[PDB]
Amino acid sequence: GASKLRAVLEKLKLSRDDISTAAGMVKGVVDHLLLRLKCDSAFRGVGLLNTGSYYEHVKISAPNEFDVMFKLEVPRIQLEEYSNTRAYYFVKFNPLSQFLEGEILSASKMLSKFRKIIKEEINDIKDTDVIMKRGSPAVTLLISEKISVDITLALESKSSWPASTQEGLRIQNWLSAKVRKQLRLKPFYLVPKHAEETWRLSFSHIEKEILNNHGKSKTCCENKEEKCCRKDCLKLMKYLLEQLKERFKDKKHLDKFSSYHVKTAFFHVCTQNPQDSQWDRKDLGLCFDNCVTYFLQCLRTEKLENYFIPEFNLFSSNLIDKRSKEFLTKQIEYERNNEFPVFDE
Ligand SMILES: Cc1ccc(-c2cc(C(=O)O)c3c(c2)ncn3-c2ccccc2)c(Cl)c1
Ligand SMILES: [Zn+2]
Numbered sequence: 001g002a003s004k005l006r007a008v009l010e011k012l013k014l015s016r017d018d019i020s021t022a023a024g025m026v027k028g029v030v031d032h033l034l035l036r037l038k039c040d041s042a043f044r045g046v047g048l049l050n051t052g053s054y055y056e057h058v059k060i061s062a063p064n065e066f067d068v069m070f071k072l073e074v075p076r077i078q079l080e081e082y083s084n085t086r087a088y089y090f091v092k093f094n095p096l097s098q099f100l101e102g103e104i105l106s107a108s109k110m111l112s113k114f115r116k117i118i119k120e121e122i123n124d125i126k127d128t129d130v131i132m133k134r135g136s137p138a139v140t141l142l143i144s145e146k147i148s149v150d151i152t153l154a155l156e157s158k159s160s161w162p163a164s165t166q167e168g169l170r171i172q173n174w175l176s177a178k179v180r181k182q183l184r185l186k187p188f189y190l191v192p193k194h195a196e197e198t199w200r201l202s203f204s205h206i207e208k209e210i211l212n213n214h215g216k217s218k219t220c221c222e223n224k225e226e227k228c229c230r231k232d233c234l235k236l237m238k239y240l241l242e243q244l245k246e247r248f249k250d251k252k253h254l255d256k257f258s259s260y261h262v263k264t265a266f267f268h269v270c271t272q273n274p275q276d277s278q279w280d281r282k283d284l285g286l287c288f289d290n291c292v293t294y295f296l297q298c299l300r301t302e303k304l305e306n307y308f309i310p311e312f313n314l315f316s317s318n319l320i321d322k323r324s325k326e327f328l329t330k331q332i333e334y335e336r337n338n339e340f341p342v343f344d345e
Contacts, residue, residue, distance in 0.1 A: 001339070002285035008239060008343050009232055015063075023058045026066045026149045029122075029130055029141065030057060033151070036121045037070070042096055042113060045073045049154060049189070053208045058149075061259050062242060066149040067137075069204065070114075071189065074155045079162055086164040087312040088195040091155065107192035107199050114138050114153050136193035136200070154189040154202060161188050162201065168308040169206075174216060174274035183209060203308045207263070215276050228279035230270065233291050237262045240292070243342045244331055253327045256320045264307050264314060265295040292336050299329040 059067035137150035
């Protein structure tokens with residue numbers, strides 16, 4: 001039961017060393033690219049956005065896959081929603097004036113200069129071997145034929161969040177209305193994920209703020225009396241998907257699913273189960289089942305709301321085809337109904 005889950009968590013700890021050295025390598029490449037991007041008049045204000053829950057500037061999206069975001073302070077920004085998509089927007093408003101097409105800031109034009117500067121730069125430093133693979137993420141780098149890092153350019157807006165987020169981040173009953181107000185005072189980000197000229201709202205930087213401050217109790221997981229299993233359930237959900245994707249690699253049925261889908265479902269379960277007593281460490285097996293059952297429901301109903309934009313369906317036909325969702329539904333059901341044989345030794 002839960003002893004199989006606890007065995008999985010123990011095994012995962014054994015690759016901490018490989019992960020930290022890989023993240024060190026990513027960190028070096030990113031610092032170098034940050035230096036050259038700052039030379040360009042367009043990207044002078046660029047900087048690293050702190051998104052990682054364990055490492056600072058580096059998010060781990062899968063084994064040997066890392067995620068980095070470059071933020072660009074762009075003030076006096078005005079948004080125009082693209083055709084009721086709730087998540088995609090035209091950006092309107094001098095350093096960036098080169099990227100204008102009318103009153104609109106072109107995502108494709110800015111991404112193209114971003115790409116070109118990075119592609120130039122990875123040639124020079126022969127300290128490590130870095131190539132460019134493959135539109136968000138802007139750049140995927142492959143380091144040493146092993147480690148891949150997705151680099152995402154993000155405009156930073158310090159304005160109030162767009163109205164499409166008004167009913168999102170539904171944490172009031174869990175983390176309190178006070179915390180939700182404070183979080184909604186932080187900046188938001190636009191990335192050039194095209195629905196073209198459209199940008200997508202991004203709140204990835206909020207994850208670290210909640211995952212490591214995750215209890216109804218302010219001292220959840222700060223002492224021996226308050227140990228919950230929230231983080232371990234998220235780890236197990238990510239590992240479930242990673243393992244399924246590897247086993248179904250012959251026909252790549254699951255290519256479209258990612259840890260972002262897993263995380264979103266997991267934080268919806270945290271909303272539904274707001275009390276720390278619903279995440280007691282002794283209850284790991286039931287808590288994990290809660291998480292998997294909700295993910296299964298999202299798959300079967302083909303509905304997974306963006307955590308911040310409730311009318312944006314991560315599982316829409318526009319984003320993931322029906323056959324892929326039907327397929328993973330079937331595999332998750334099987335795993336859940338059979339006590340997760342994908343976790344067997
Ligand atoms: C509590 C909490 C906090 C943050 C997130 C979060 C949000 C986004 C987003 O789209 O705003 C994320 C992400 C994680 N990882 C990736 N993206 C992302 C970013 C841009 C485009 C597509 C995808 C979640 Cl799920 C829950
Ligand atoms: Zn806790």
